[PDB]
Design a protein around this ligand. Sequence first.
Ligand SMILES: *[C@@H]1O[C@H](CO)[C@@H](O[C@@H]2O[C@H](CO)[C@@H](O)[C@H](O)[C@H]2NC(C)=O)[C@H](O)[C@H]1NC(C)=O
Ligand SMILES: COc1cc(/C=C/C(=O)O)ccc1O
Ligand SMILES: [Mg+2]
Length: 242
Amino acid sequence: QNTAGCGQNPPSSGVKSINVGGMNREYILQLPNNYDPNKGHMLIFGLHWLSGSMHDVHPNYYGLRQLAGNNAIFISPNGINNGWANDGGRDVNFIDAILQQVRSQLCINDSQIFATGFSFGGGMSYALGCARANVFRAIAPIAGAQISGCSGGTSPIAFLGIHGTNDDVLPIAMGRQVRDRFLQNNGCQPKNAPEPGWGQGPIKTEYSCQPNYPVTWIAFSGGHDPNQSFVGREIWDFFSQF
Ligand SMILES: *[C@@H]1O[C@H](CO)[C@@H](O[C@@H]2O[C@H](CO)[C@@H](O)[C@H](O)[C@H]2NC(C)=O)[C@H](O)[C@H]1NC(C)=O
Ligand SMILES: COc1cc(/C=C/C(=O)O)ccc1O
Ligand SMILES: [Mg+2]
């Protein structure tokens, strides 16, 4: 179902500021090349990593921008202290405030709201899946871990996890913990997920879960690096199935 912003004159793309409980915070809004204000769009949050900023995720959005056509609106929010510590839920509240604002300004399909990010931004995507499973259709942490909290975390939500076997910063076992939570929440049948050897190609494992709540795990043989050529393709294909 489409939001109240449908049919309204659109704002401009660029850096926006927003008051969150007295705290001034900032995000980048990127409209598609051809924005039809009468068509419901996907909404994709891309979340930066530690010591990064919103300006590192924009303009490429982990490879999604080049694949998305006119179907998606992109948002790159800025973390406090170049991170997503999410103290007391303040970063979940930030996302709540962005959503309230953009849904009233833009034509968004409420069943196509997504979040993805790398490392600390993958932790933050996980926190949104824990606390806002009613809002987000799917999350895709890249080298994620439980480092931004997880309040709630019992509801199902479609999940794609990507992680490198030789990641020395957030070891892959931390990403498997995130995955295993949604294998339980989504009612997935137990299944072995093989992971590649050194110098071997990525291995994607698709689980059998409740119909609306798929779980996919992709392990690649590299390290702490989101710039693999399959990343944008796999995330887009996962998001566009809904
Ligand atoms: C908003 O998004 C939903 C889900 O993507 C759309 O519902 C889909 O409609 C297409 C039409 O063939 C089919 O793939 C399915 O029937 C629906 N997919 C689901 C429910 O996952 C919906 O049409 C979009 N637009 C509006 C106005 O709701
Ligand atoms: C190991 O624990 C942590 C790791 C990170 C790394 C974030 C990043 O690389 O983006 C952040 C916070 C942590 O508590
Ligand atoms: Mg298109």
